[PDB]
Amino acid sequence: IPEYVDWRQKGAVTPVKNQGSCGSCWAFSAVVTIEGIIKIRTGNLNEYSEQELLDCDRRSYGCNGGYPWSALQLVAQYGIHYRNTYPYEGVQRYCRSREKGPYAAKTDGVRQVQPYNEGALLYSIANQPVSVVLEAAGKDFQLYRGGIFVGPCGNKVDHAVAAVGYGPNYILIKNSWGTGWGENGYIRIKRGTGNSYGVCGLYTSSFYPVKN
């Protein structure tokens, strides 16, 4: 795999979103991997509905948090609508997939990256954007304004984001806190420290959709 990967330069990443007060990061995370894999397989970049996952993933807890892998299984099992037809409201409502007509896209499954393995994650990122989790509650992460983030942070992961790239000394993360946070909405997190958790627990739980 190359020294540098940036799925934004291959046009597989849509604009940075803001999840708002809602703890819907798990849905935003899952969506950017869906947006990535559909662009990689069909050449078409579309935005898909975080709100639909928010409303429809019964295993997750809406704005109280949830599981990227459950959201990803939902899209594998049923499908997902365009963001335009099912826009983000920042509040869990009822599942309205059936009122929105046919699904815009479907995936074929979900795989977990082998946990606590930096190489395994990098290999997956070289293939497609990956849903990863990290500890975002620390003030240093929240006040991140740019550069390669090394912490401080622990491993109490609490926030789902998407890895969309990497370089020799970092992994490139799309956050869902709007374009004003970090590097126009992104954070580069140090890799290669030999801590098997990853910086801020980044290697704890990583998932990507499969599309044949």
Numbering used by the authors: 1 to 212
What does the paper say about this structure?
We next interrogated ligand interactions of the cysteine protease papain, as isolated from papaya latex. Papain crystals were readily grown and cocrystallized or soaked with target ligands for MicroED analysis. Mass spectra acquired from apo papain crystals harvested from a TEM grid showed masses corresponding to the protein with both a doubly oxidized, sulfinic acid form (+32 Da) of its catalytic residue Cys25, and a reduced form of the protein. The assignment of this oxidation state is substantiated by its resistance to reduction with dithiothreitol (DTT) or tris(2-carboxyethyl)phospine (TCEP), unlike other +32 Da modifications such as persulfides, which would be reduced under these conditions.
